[PDB]
Design a protein around this ligand. Structure first.
Ligand SMILES: [Mg+2]
Ligand SMILES: [Mg+2]
Ligand SMILES: [Mg+2]
Ligand SMILES: [Mg+2]
Ligand SMILES: [Mg+2]
Ligand SMILES: [Mg+2]
Ligand SMILES: [Mg+2]
Ligand SMILES: [Mg+2]
Ligand SMILES: [Mg+2]
Ligand SMILES: [Mg+2]
Ligand SMILES: [Mg+2]
Ligand SMILES: [Mg+2]
Ligand SMILES: [Mg+2]
Ligand SMILES: [Mg+2]
Ligand SMILES: [Mg+2]
Ligand SMILES: [Mg+2]
Ligand SMILES: [Mg+2]
Ligand SMILES: [Mg+2]
Ligand SMILES: [Mg+2]
Ligand SMILES: [Mg+2]
Ligand SMILES: [Mg+2]
Ligand SMILES: [Mg+2]
Ligand SMILES: [Mg+2]
Ligand SMILES: [Mg+2]
Ligand SMILES: [Mg+2]
Ligand SMILES: [Mg+2]
Ligand SMILES: [Mg+2]
Ligand SMILES: [Mg+2]
Ligand SMILES: [Mg+2]
Ligand SMILES: [Mg+2]
Ligand SMILES: [Mg+2]
Ligand SMILES: [Mg+2]
Ligand SMILES: [Mg+2]
Ligand SMILES: [Mg+2]
Ligand SMILES: [Mg+2]
Ligand SMILES: [Mg+2]
Lengths: 63, 203, 58, 144
RNA sequence: GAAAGUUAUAAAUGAAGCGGUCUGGAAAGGCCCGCCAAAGACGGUAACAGCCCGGUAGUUGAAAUGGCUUUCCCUCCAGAGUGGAUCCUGAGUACGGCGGAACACGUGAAAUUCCGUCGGAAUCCGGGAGGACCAUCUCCCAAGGCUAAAUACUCCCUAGUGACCGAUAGUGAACCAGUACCGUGAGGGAAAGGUGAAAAGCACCCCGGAAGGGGAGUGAAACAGUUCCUGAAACCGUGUGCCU
RNA sequence: GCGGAAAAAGCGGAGCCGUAGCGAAAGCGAGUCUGAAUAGGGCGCAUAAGUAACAGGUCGUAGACCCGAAACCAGGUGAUC
RNA sequence: GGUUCGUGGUAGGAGAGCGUUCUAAGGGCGGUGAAGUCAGACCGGAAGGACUGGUGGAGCGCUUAGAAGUGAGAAUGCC
């Protein structure tokens, strides 16, 4: 049978042109009194999946 | 190349299309296609019984501890004499096709090989009034075959198939039915002018 | 144990807790023993309240 | 048929483990010693991290999918040079020739490349640059 | 209901070498000559056979029964147009609440479908659906029923096939096997194939109560002797070259 | 799928992958998103190769390298002890 | 073809091979004795391979490719 996509991941990662995965940052709901405005500006941007993580998860989101 | 009659006499010469019979043979492609065609003939009807499929074997043969025997789960576990087979054959298809373009190159290349080897005899006619194996055998002497030979014919000529049916190395086929493995299985390729037209019409 | 008019009878399904634990239960029809005459002669038969609603013998 | 040689490098002998120590894959058969990964059927599921919360759960879900998302078949100018000068390029002509096979939601013309010929291009959409470029050559764009 | 055709269930006919010679127990094998072939399938026959046998291709064949296909019989049968006064067009139904279920869809914003329970329409100026819901538009007309084919499976039958097994394999079962045997019972569940081409299966003599032997005979072989092709290893012995 | 010999071709372009990306999305497009920005920055382009088939390696779903529990559930059989 | 530096090794990675059954094609062996089996002081770097002779009494190699139920000394393994 066909491999199944990991749906949790398909709702969180996006594949870039070069074939990398782009993601959002964690600490970005609530508890915003506890984070600095600089932290907030940084956490608001997207990020790439690290090489180590990518090795672990790439089959989960092929397709 | 030359164009001889059933009797064996020369009838001028025919000009084979160089895009079908002239091309530089691609041996590597012909080998791939031969292997695929041999694989596709397999029936693959082979099975064994795994430990689930073998009769009986439901109960634990003796208690896990205390008897001084090796622990065993079923009398049909695979290390038991009449037990299940661990992997072993399962019914499966071995068939696969290379891409169409590679399959066309393969037939073009095997046919070009036969011309290079001077193993292709083009006949004006080939017909028999009645099914007569003696006549077909005499024909093969006149053409000077004395080997396995694939005979390709178009102008229906039902009497050709019957007349060559009992000869051991000889195969008669339509023209629509020419295949890499049938050309490879046979030394000489004898083809009627009418059949050459039909083969070039496709390639 | 079945409505003679309709065919209403017990059917199975789930009881569900908060927490959504499921366990099998039934739904019985609201069958009542009543005298009617389906065939000419009267007789005491199970009939659903729903079947009685409106026009039946009694 | 008695002298078949498959292309060199096209076929390789499969590796068979558990067939003695000489091979280098005998006994433990490449699995090393014990633990979950030595066992038949052994190994954790794909993104599993041994109980550390997996990456995908550390990060938030984002966005939605539009039920009415339009995706256009893209045609860069360069391929329009294929056509003869003073020719009327339609979608039907762009699929016959074999430039766009499936015309998803429509045909959009994009600038990428440079056009030489003076055409009359009709498509569902044009990039501002594409329109300018088709015209700069000496053509007319129509939006069907 | 007939009739005709055809298929099935028995069969019939069917080409060509006793060819020479070599080895051999035997020739189908070797060597050298022929021949048939719409037949060079398969099997058998004293070793490997197109031409020895059963057959095979091809061509024929059915008293009886069954199937199928046609034709006949027999049986059955109204279908267009024009209006729109009125009438009809599936009710405890649709739907709703409550509780469940089915929907890929876990009650969710939850359409659609079903069950229990309670409530309960409209009914052509009518009704349903288009994923809460309303409006518009579009497409449909529920609460009655029937319907072949394309699909699933094989205890069977017929004909075949296999880079499937070859007796610890392949069915549990090649052999009187669901037997023997075990179990109160449900149930569990084995082992076990091979003389030779042919019985020509060892007359007769000898030792022995017999078993079993030794001769003699058969046979190509008996160190093929009624479980009898081959006959490994463990293991058991006899003899003795070197050592103790 | 049709055709056929459990063929070979031929037919079959529906579909799939690639040829453009960026954005949650509307969308725009060699750019795009963010942003008041003609700024900077992210991902892309400028530094085109893919696709079909077979073979090797590894992974996923399947018992998934083999043997082994104690247990659990379902239908039966037992009070000749 | 030389030169230089190398060549202990468990888990483990990489490579090249041996042998087994089956298939195809080619080419062979075999009642003047096939496979199997027994023996030997032979050959190859290894896996392994021949030769000769006994037994055996009818099938079997080789070459190139292909496919795998493809290699056992251990499982208190099963018979
Ligand atoms: Mg928030
Ligand atoms: Mg079982
Ligand atoms: Mg002990
Ligand atoms: Mg077995
Ligand atoms: Mg290897
Ligand atoms: Mg190692
Ligand atoms: Mg070991
Ligand atoms: Mg270990
Ligand atoms: Mg480990
Ligand atoms: Mg924790
Ligand atoms: Mg005869
Ligand atoms: Mg003689
Ligand atoms: Mg014999
Ligand atoms: Mg014989
Ligand atoms: Mg409900
Ligand atoms: Mg559900
Ligand atoms: Mg609605
Ligand atoms: Mg209700
Ligand atoms: Mg509704
Ligand atoms: Mg809607
Ligand atoms: Mg929806
Ligand atoms: Mg209606
Ligand atoms: Mg058996
Ligand atoms: Mg045996
Ligand atoms: Mg058995
Ligand atoms: Mg005996
Ligand atoms: Mg319990
Ligand atoms: Mg009882
Ligand atoms: Mg008593
Ligand atoms: Mg050293
Ligand atoms: Mg080393
Ligand atoms: Mg390796
Ligand atoms: Mg053998
Ligand atoms: Mg032996
Ligand atoms: Mg094995
Ligand atoms: Mg042992």
């Amino acid at each position: 049978p066909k491999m199944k996509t990991h749906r949790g991941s398909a709702k969180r990662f996006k594949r870039t042109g070069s074939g990398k995965l782009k993601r959002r940052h964690g600490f970005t709901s609530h508890m915003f009194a506890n984070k600095s405005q600089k932290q907030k500006r940084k956490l608001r941007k997207s990020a790439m999946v690290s090489a180590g993580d990518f090795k672990r998860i790439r089959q989960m989101v092929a397709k | 190349l030359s164009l001889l009659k059933q009797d064996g006499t020369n009838a001028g010469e025919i000009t084979l299309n160089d895009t079908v019979f002239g091309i530089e043979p691609n041996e590597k492609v012909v080998v791939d296609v031969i292997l695929s065609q041999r694989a596709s003939l397999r029936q693959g009807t082979h099975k064994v019984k795994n430990r689930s499929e073998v009769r009986g074997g439901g109960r634990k043969p003796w208690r896990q501890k205390g008897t001084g025997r090796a622990r065993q789960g079923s009398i049909r576990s695979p290390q038991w004499r009449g037990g299940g087979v661990v992997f072993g054959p399962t019914p499966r298809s071995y068939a696969y096709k290379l891409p169409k373009k590679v399959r066309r190159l393969a037939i073009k290349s095997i046919l070009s090989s036969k011309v290079n080897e001077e193993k292709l005899v083009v006949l004006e006619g080939l017909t028999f009034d009645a099914p007569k194996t003696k006549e077909f055998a005499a024909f093969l002497k006149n053409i000077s075959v004395d080997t396995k030979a694939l005979i390709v014919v178009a102008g229906e000529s039902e009497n050709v198939e019957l007349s060559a049916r009992n000869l051991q190395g000889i195969t008669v086929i339509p023209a629509e039915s020419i295949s890499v493995l049938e050309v490879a299985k046979h030394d000489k390729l004898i083809i009627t002018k009418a059949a050459v037209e039909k083969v070039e019409e496709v390639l | 144990k079945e409505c003679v008019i309709t065919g209403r009878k017990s059917r199975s399904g789930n009881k569900r807790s908060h927490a959504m634990n499921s366990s099998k239960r039934t739904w019985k029809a609201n069958l009542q023993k009543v005298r009617i005459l389906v065939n000419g002669k009267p007789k005491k038969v199970w009939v659903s309240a729903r079947a009685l609603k409106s026009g039946k013998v009694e | 048929l008695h002298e078949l040689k498959p292309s060199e490098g096209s076929r390789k002998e499969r590796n068979r483990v558990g067939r003695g120590t000489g091979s280098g894959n005998g006994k433990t058969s490449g699995r090393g010693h014990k633990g979950q990964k030595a066992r038949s059927g052994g190994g954790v599921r794909l993104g599993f991290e041994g109980g550390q919360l997996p990456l995908f759960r550390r990060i938030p879900k984002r966005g939605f999918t539009n039920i009415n998302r339009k995706e256009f078949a893209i045609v860069n100018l360069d391929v329009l040079n294929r056509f003869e000068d003073g020719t009327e390029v339609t979608p039907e002509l762009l699929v016959e020739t074999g430039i766009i096979r499936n015309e998803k939601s429509g045909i959009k013309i994009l600038s990428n490349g440079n056009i030489e010929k003076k055409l009359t291009v009709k498509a569902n959409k044009f990039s501002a640059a594409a329109k300018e470029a088709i015209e700069a050559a000496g053509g007319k764009t129509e939006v069907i």
